[PDB]
Write an enzyme that holds these catalytic residues in place. Structure first.
Site, PDB file in Angstrom:
ATOM      1  CG  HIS B  41      -0.395   0.061   2.529  1.00  0.00           C
ATOM      2  ND1 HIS B  41       0.444   1.092   2.890  1.00  0.00           N
ATOM      3  CD2 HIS B  41      -0.418  -0.786   3.589  1.00  0.00           C
ATOM      4  CE1 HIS B  41       0.885   0.899   4.120  1.00  0.00           C
ATOM      5  NE2 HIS B  41       0.378  -0.234   4.569  1.00  0.00           N
ATOM      6  N   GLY B 131       3.377   6.726   9.931  1.00  0.00           N
ATOM      7  CA  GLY B 131       4.756   6.659   9.536  1.00  0.00           C
ATOM      8  C   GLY B 131       5.437   5.378   9.940  1.00  0.00           C
ATOM      9  CB  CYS B 133       3.270   1.443   7.253  1.00  0.00           C
ATOM     10  SG  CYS B 133       1.557   1.503   7.620  1.00  0.00           S
TER      11      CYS B 133
HETATM   12  C1  LIG Z   1       0.673   2.159   9.003  1.00  0.00           C
HETATM   13  C2  LIG Z   1       0.827   3.637   8.782  1.00  0.00           C
HETATM   14  O1  LIG Z   1       1.718   4.277   9.332  1.00  0.00           O
HETATM   15  N1  LIG Z   1      -0.024   4.255   7.903  1.00  0.00           N
HETATM   16  C3  LIG Z   1      -0.982   3.562   7.085  1.00  0.00           C
HETATM   17  C4  LIG Z   1      -2.099   2.969   7.647  1.00  0.00           C
HETATM   18  C5  LIG Z   1      -3.023   2.336   6.831  1.00  0.00           C
HETATM   19  C6  LIG Z   1      -2.847   2.297   5.450  1.00  0.00           C
HETATM   20  C7  LIG Z   1      -3.933   1.701   4.615  1.00  0.00           C
HETATM   21  O2  LIG Z   1      -4.910   1.137   5.059  1.00  0.00           O
HETATM   22  O3  LIG Z   1      -3.718   1.869   3.313  1.00  0.00           O
HETATM   23  C8  LIG Z   1      -4.734   1.327   2.440  1.00  0.00           C
HETATM   24  C9  LIG Z   1      -1.723   2.889   4.883  1.00  0.00           C
HETATM   25  C10 LIG Z   1      -0.784   3.529   5.697  1.00  0.00           C
HETATM   26  N2  LIG Z   1       0.332   4.139   5.085  1.00  0.00           N
HETATM   27  C11 LIG Z   1       1.145   5.178   5.454  1.00  0.00           C
HETATM   28  C12 LIG Z   1       0.981   5.977   6.547  1.00  0.00           C
HETATM   29  C13 LIG Z   1       1.729   7.234   6.643  1.00  0.00           C
HETATM   30  O4  LIG Z   1       1.471   8.066   7.511  1.00  0.00           O
HETATM   31  C14 LIG Z   1       2.857   7.468   5.672  1.00  0.00           C
HETATM   32  C15 LIG Z   1       2.643   6.812   4.326  1.00  0.00           C
HETATM   33  C16 LIG Z   1       2.273   5.341   4.489  1.00  0.00           C
HETATM   34  C17 LIG Z   1       0.091   5.656   7.723  1.00  0.00           C
HETATM   35  C18 LIG Z   1      -1.288   6.307   7.652  1.00  0.00           C
HETATM   36  C19 LIG Z   1      -1.697   6.942   6.490  1.00  0.00           C
HETATM   37  C20 LIG Z   1      -2.991   7.437   6.370  1.00  0.00           C
HETATM   38  C21 LIG Z   1      -3.904   7.306   7.410  1.00  0.00           C
HETATM   39  C22 LIG Z   1      -5.345   7.692   7.200  1.00  0.00           C
HETATM   40  F1  LIG Z   1      -5.473   8.825   6.479  1.00  0.00           F
HETATM   41  F2  LIG Z   1      -6.035   6.749   6.542  1.00  0.00           F
HETATM   42  F3  LIG Z   1      -6.037   7.886   8.344  1.00  0.00           F
HETATM   43  C23 LIG Z   1      -3.486   6.678   8.576  1.00  0.00           C
HETATM   44  C24 LIG Z   1      -2.189   6.180   8.698  1.00  0.00           C
END
Ligand SMILES: *CC(=O)N1c2ccc(C(=O)OC)cc2NC2=C(C(=O)CCC2)[C@H]1c1ccc(C(F)(F)F)cc1
Ligand SMILES: *CC(=O)N1c2ccc(C(=O)OC)cc2NC2=C(C(=O)CCC2)[C@H]1c1ccc(C(F)(F)F)cc1
Lengths: 290, 290
Positions: B41, B131, B133
């Site tokens: 993702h 951040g 992930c």
């Molecule tokens: C794990 C993590 O840090 N993040 C995350 C969480 C979930 C997903 C997802 O379900 O994608 C389909 C993706 C991510 N990816 C990333 C982030 C980041 O902050 C940096 C870039 C990768 C975070 C994250 C991103 C967005 C959100 C939101 F907007 F959905 F709430 C939450 C955490």
């Protein structure tokens, strides 16, 4: 989200760890620049701890000690080769209440890392086995390593005792086997208040009744429960957490006061049914807001 | 002496950590041999997680991706330079109840390490911020690193979810933002029994009443308190601890049974007033007898 008891990464300390043998006696030591530190009771023999010449190996590389000296309670083995894996460091002294990470080692190889606090009685509730003497406790600031603890001995009550990196012991303690009854450790109140903030941030708010109470009325109660008194400096440092959660320090004081007097009652705060005192307010900020 | 919740040293993983950016999106990835792993993702953009081209930097050294592919839920960025800091490794899959260490990272730099368990519902009670992930969870055997977890997402209940290092998710979960209600996690009974052993070894024996009880009578009680049933395989693995403390498994079962039904009552076992289930029996042997 989530709150979890969390040690600093141990990579920069692991490569400063070394095995030190003197006569029959071998333990752990710290290698910085061209000097190796270790507890001075390495020159004793263990048979004599019951009733009234150096090898330094960095895994497989033998260093020649070219001389040594004794600063207080630690031996400073000067070696000829200088450790290239020496990070940014400084020798800080810790005050009771502050926390650090301990990298426990046996025969110079790292086995574990964990987080603990310097108790108000100057002992630490570690996890140490024979062979662990010389393990170090430290904090890191992104790339600068603040060494603040070296392990020496286990008191009769199971708790542990050691020095700063300049050789001076933390409490009223000495590098010898005696019944050294340390004082009662009081519960670190500023830290319990900080953990309560971490709870609020993360989900749990049931304890938040907050019948407003004053500072000293709280202290009155706090002490007859064996809680160290709260000063103005402690209030100040909770400032940031206060700012984030929108719950003034006196409120969280008050709510804790009904916890001391009306009890947990099996109810759960952040995975626990007793009041945790081994997280500093900076801990909460590092973990809960980067 | 002392029992303390203890992570493996993080040095060998820290130097396999790298920052990965795809479009606007940047997270953490793992560098082994000449391939970098990370959650797939990374190719999504975050605006689209609300309603219905590679940079790889190892601190400061830029790697060229020369191609990629998708194994299940992880992306395998093939790079041209091969990581010289690659330890002995193997990709193990964990079963519920086993434990590991998590090295949480942001923008590819390690910030913390901590120990946690794979819950019976296949979630883990982590400490993760945006951040994080791509952080990995692992065990080590003196010098061989068994990677077993990569972080993907945070469920609505605060708990966390991820995959093994081959891309397959641990539970009934997917790399997308939905109300994925995971099952109730039951309390890991074999582990609670193992922690009770660690208590005995270290000081605490008040809970040892041990009115002898049978296996299944215990299980009857255990389940109406939300304790996973105990099998013969669980009994076997407590063998060593049983041997050391001289208290048969059925005894500790029985004593715990009076804990489930007569309660902790504020009384303390190894610094806690609730029954800890996130230490495996091998954990206790590693910590309590080298
Ligand atoms: C794990 C993590 O840090 N993040 C995350 C969480 C979930 C997903 C997802 O379900 O994608 C389909 C993706 C991510 N990816 C990333 C982030 C980041 O902050 C940096 C870039 C990768 C975070 C994250 C991103 C967005 C959100 C939101 F907007 F959905 F709430 C939450 C955490
Ligand atoms: C800290 C540690 O691991 N040990 C230890 C504890 C106390 C003292 C002491 O008071 O000396 C005056 C010294 C040591 N030193 C060493 C060990 C070892 O196991 C390896 C060699 C260094 C242990 C230790 C040694 C002896 C005993 C005894 F016999 F007193 F009970 C206990 C722990």
């Amino acid at each position: 989200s989530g709150f979890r008891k969390m040690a600093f990464p141990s990579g920069k300390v692991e490569g400063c760890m070394v095995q030190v043998t003197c006569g029959t006696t071998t333990l752990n030591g710290l290698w910085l620049d061209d000097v190796v530190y270790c507890p001075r009771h390495v020159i004793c023999t263990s048979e004599d701890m019951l009733n009234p010449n150096f090898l330094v190996q960095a895994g497989n590389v033998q260093l020649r000690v070219i001389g040594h000296s004794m600063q207080n309670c630690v031996l400073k083995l000067k070696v000829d080769t200088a450790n290239p894996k020496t990070p940014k460091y400084k020798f800080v002294r810790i005050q009771p209440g502050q926390t650090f990470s301990v990298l426990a080692c046996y025969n110079g190889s790292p086995s574990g890392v964990y987080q603990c606090a310097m108790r108000p009685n100057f002992t630490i509730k570690g996890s140490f086995l024979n062979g662990s003497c010389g393990s170090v406790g430290f904090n890191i600031d992104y790339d600068c390593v603040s060494f603040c603890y070296m392990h020496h001995m286990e008191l009769p009550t199971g708790v542990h005792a050691g020095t700063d990196l300049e050789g001076n012991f933390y409490g009223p303690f000495v590098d010898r086997q005696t019944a050294q009854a340390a004082g009662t450790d009081t519960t670190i109140t500023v830290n319990v208040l900080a953990w309560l903030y971490a709870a609020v941030i993360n989900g749990d708010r049931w304890f938040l009744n907050r019948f407003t109470t004053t500072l000293n009325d709280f202290n009155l109660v706090a002490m007859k429960y064996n809680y160290e008194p709260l000063t103005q400096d402690h209030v100040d440092i909770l400032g940031p957490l206060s700012a984030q959660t929108g719950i003034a320090v006196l409120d969280m004081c008050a709510s804790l006061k009904e916890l001391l007097q009306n009890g947990m009652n099996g109810r759960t705060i952040l995975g626990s049914a007793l009041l945790e005192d081994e997280f500093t307010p900076f801990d909460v900020v590092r973990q809960c807001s980067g």
